[PDB]
Design a protein around this nucleic acid. Structure first.
Ligand SMILES: [Mg+2]
Ligand SMILES: [Mg+2]
Ligand SMILES: [Mg+2]
Ligand SMILES: [Mg+2]
Lengths: 179, 105
RNA sequence: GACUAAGUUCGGCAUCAAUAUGGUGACCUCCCGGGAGCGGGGGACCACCAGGUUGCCUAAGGAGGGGUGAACCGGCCCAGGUCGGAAACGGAGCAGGUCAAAACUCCCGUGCUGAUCAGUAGUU
């Protein structure tokens, strides 16, 4: 069984909103997709859709928390909810990193899941402003994504590289607070 | 004319403090009538006179069993207490409350 | 036709909790002043609200938007009338007006969950 996490999220995200940052639409897209998936599907695993499903669960929460932060910009009561969604996003991501350690799923997918789990983990701690714990997660994420990138040609590694470029600002912010 | 007023609402256990009542429910009674009040006060030797046609301002029930006001004298108008047993309005009320029930029941 | 995920449409079910501060409404129990309506003040309890931290909290639980609040039951402003008053004025409160804050209820969001349409694709 196989699942290419970073590629999936990057293409779902860009097609249904995040081109313009519309986390509402994309989250909705995640919800509906999760409907289709469970409907089609309805013991560890059989197919690779289960893995796609749990990811959508982690994606929904994640996107929500992100919609929330655009909103809590003015509505600090929402910032409480933001942090809840984000903590939920990690719960589903952990639960995901739990499923991909079953031995009928390849190690490339194992890497993605622990890199994803690190990404979100990085995000939660970064929002709690836990700068050392957050930067640990951001480097863990950076380290694993760099590991994935070397094992492929430069073309395949482009996606991985732009994601580490993507989280590099986050890494930078944490640093100047532990100075 | 310098006598304390007393409404039956003050003693009615089926009324809230906001509805008039002046004494704790435990010591209060059910539906005391100005008549009942006058009778138990007078019978102890208090000077009391009954105003059959005064209504309580906070009283809303226009039927006779809740109308009435009982005026009581505490003082001989030299300032002294008519009786030493009854220095205060409260002392009156609590007693009436204590005595009304021995009548009908 | 079979598989893949989008699009179309109408339903059902459902929608956490704790802290600090202030607020509202009730209700209970004490004092104190008064010829009444009433005035001054100490505690106790309950309900709700605002918005400041949060969680052994969610499948998801906004600190949304509305409406009813009547034949008596919310709170407020209360014509008349009414009770108390010598009166001033006040009580209780109708018609009418009104609501951060009884209770009820719809909408939005959120979650699960039946279902619709095109025979639409992607690809056989
Ligand atoms: Mg008193
Ligand atoms: Mg509904
Ligand atoms: Mg109180
Ligand atoms: Mg509140």
């Amino acid at each position: 069984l196989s699942l290419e996490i970073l590629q999936i999220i990057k293409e779902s995200q860009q097609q249904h909103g995040l081109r313009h940052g519309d986390f509402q639409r994309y989250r909705g897209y995640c919800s509906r997709r999760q409907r289709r998936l469970r409907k089609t599907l309805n013991d560890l695993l059989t197919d690779n859709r289960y893995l796609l499903l749990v990811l959508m669960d982690a994606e929904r929460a994640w996107s929500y928390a992100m919609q929330l932060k655009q909103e809590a910009n003015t509505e600090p009561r929402k910032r409480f909810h933001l942090l809840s969604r984000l903590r939920k996003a990690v719960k589903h991501a952990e639960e995901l990193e739990r499923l991909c350690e079953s031995n009928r799923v390849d190690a490339k997918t194992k890497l993605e899941a622990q890199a994803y789990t690190a990404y979100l983990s990085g995000m939660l701690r970064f929002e709690h402003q836990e700068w050392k714990a957050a930067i640990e997660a951001f480097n863990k994420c950076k380290t694993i994504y760099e590991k994935l990138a070397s094992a492929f040609t430069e073309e395949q590694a482009v996606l991985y590289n732009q994601r580490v470029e993507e989280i590099s600002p986050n890494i930078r912010y944490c640093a100047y607070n532990i100075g | 004319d310098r006598f304390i007023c007393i409404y039956p609402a003050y003693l009615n256990n089926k009324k809230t403090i906001a509805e008039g009542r002046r004494i704790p429910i435990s010591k209060a009674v059910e539906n005391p009538t100005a008549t009942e009040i006058q009778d138990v006060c007078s019978a102890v030797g208090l000077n009391v006179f009954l105003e059959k046609n005064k209504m309580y301002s906070r009283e809303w029930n226009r039927d006779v069993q809740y109308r009435g006001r009982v005026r009581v004298q505490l003082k001989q108008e030299d300032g002294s207490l008519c009786l030493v047993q009854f220095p205060s309005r409260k002392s009156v009320m609590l007693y009436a409350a204590e005595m009304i029930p021995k009548l009908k029941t």
